C-alpha cells in the first residue's frame, strides 16, 4: 500500500513541478546492511526481468563500436536482413577517434541513445568516448560478444560475426535492466520509464530485481548484495526519496 501510494504521489508531483516534468525516468536507490566488495568498473552487469519488457531495439537509437578492420562487420550487419533496421550507426574505434572531438563528442552524447561496444574494446573505450558519457549510469556503454567464439591460450582466434546472436543479445539487453557494482551500501538501479508501463509492472519489476539481487546462485552476476537489505527508496532524477520496506 505504502509503495503504491508513493508511486501515485511521485507521479502527481512529477506532473506538478516543471523540472520534474523535464526528467522522465524512474530509479530505485537500495541501501543494504553491509558494504559491497567489487571496486566500481564501468561494465554494466544486467539483471534479468521475467515478466514485462522495458524497451525495444525498435525504440532505441543504437551505435555499435567494432574492432579496427570493421569491413566484414559493417557489411554483414547492414546486409543480412536481421540487423539492417537495427543499428543506427556502425563505427570503428579508429574512425571514432579520427572523427569526433569536443563539441562533436557532445553532439554524439545528445544524438545517440544507446551505445554497445565490442567487449575487447570496452576497456579501451572511455578516453575516446569522453568525460561526458561516464556520468552516472544513464548512457553507460554495454559490451556484446560479437561472434559466439572463445579464445584458448597460445591459440589464434578466428574473426566472425552472426546477426541472430547479436540480435538476441540486443533484444535481451533491451528487455531487461542493469546495475553497477559499488563499495558503499547505497546503490541504484534504473527501473522503468514513467509512461511505457504502469504501477503493477513497476512493482513486479521491483520484486524481480530485489529477488535476483538477493539470490545466492548466479553469484558472478546475481549474488552481490551483502547482508540484509535495509531499505528501498524510489526517486526520479529530480525528486526526493520515497521510502519502502524500512526493515
Amino acid at each position: 500500500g505504502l509503495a503504491e501510494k508513493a508511486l501515485k504521489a511521485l507521479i502527481l508531483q512529477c506532473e506538478e513541478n516543471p523540472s520534474l516534468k523535464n526528467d522522465k525516468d524512474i530509479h530505485i536507490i537500495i541501501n543494504t546492511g553491509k558494504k559491497m566488495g567489487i571496486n566500481r568498473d564501468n561494465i554494466p552487469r544486467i539483471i534479468p526481468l521475467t515478466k514485462y519488457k522495458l524497451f525495444k531495439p525498435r525504440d532505441l537509437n543504437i551505435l555499435l563500436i567494432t574492432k579496427d578492420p570493421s569491413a566484414l562487420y559493417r557489411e554483414t550487419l547492414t546486409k543480412d536482413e536481421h540487423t539492417s533496421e537495427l543499428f543506427k550507426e556502425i563505427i570503428s574505434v579508429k574512425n571514432l577517434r579520427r572523427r569526433f572531438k569536443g563539441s562533436k563528442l557532445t553532439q554524439l552524447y545528445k544524438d545517440f541513445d544507446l551505445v554497445v561496444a565490442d567487449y575487447r574494446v570496452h576497456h579501451l573505450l572511455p578516453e575516446v568516448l569522453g568525460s561526458r558519457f561516464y556520468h552516472g549510469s544513464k548512457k553507460l556503454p554495454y559490451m556484446i560478444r560479437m561472434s559466439k567464439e572463445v579464445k584458448l591460450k597460445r591459440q589464434q582466434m578466428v574473426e566472425k560475426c552472426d546477426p541472430i546472436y547479436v540480435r538476441a543479445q540486443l533484444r535481451s539487453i533491451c528487455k531487461n535492466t542493469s546495475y553497477i557494482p559499488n563499495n558503499d551500501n547505497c546503490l541504484s538501479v534504473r527501473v522503468g520509464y514513467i509512461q511505457k508501463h504502469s504501477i503493477p509492472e513497476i512493482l513486479q519489476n521491483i520484486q524481480d530485481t530485489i529477488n535476483f539481487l538477493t539470490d545466492k546462485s548466479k553469484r558472478p552476476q546475481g549474488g552481490v548484495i551483502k547482508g540484509g537489505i535495509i531499505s528501498i527508496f524510489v526517486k526520479t532524477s529530480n525528486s526526493t526519496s520515497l521510502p519502502i520496506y524500512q526493515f
Partner: peptide
C-alpha cells in the same frame, strides 16, 4: 499530501541533528 510530508520529515531530521 505525502511528498510535502516526507520532505518535512527530512527537514525535521536535519534540524534535530
Amino acid at each position: 499530501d505525502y511528498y510535502q510530508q516526507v520532505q518535512r520529515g527530512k527537514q525535521d531530521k536535519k534540524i534535530s541533528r
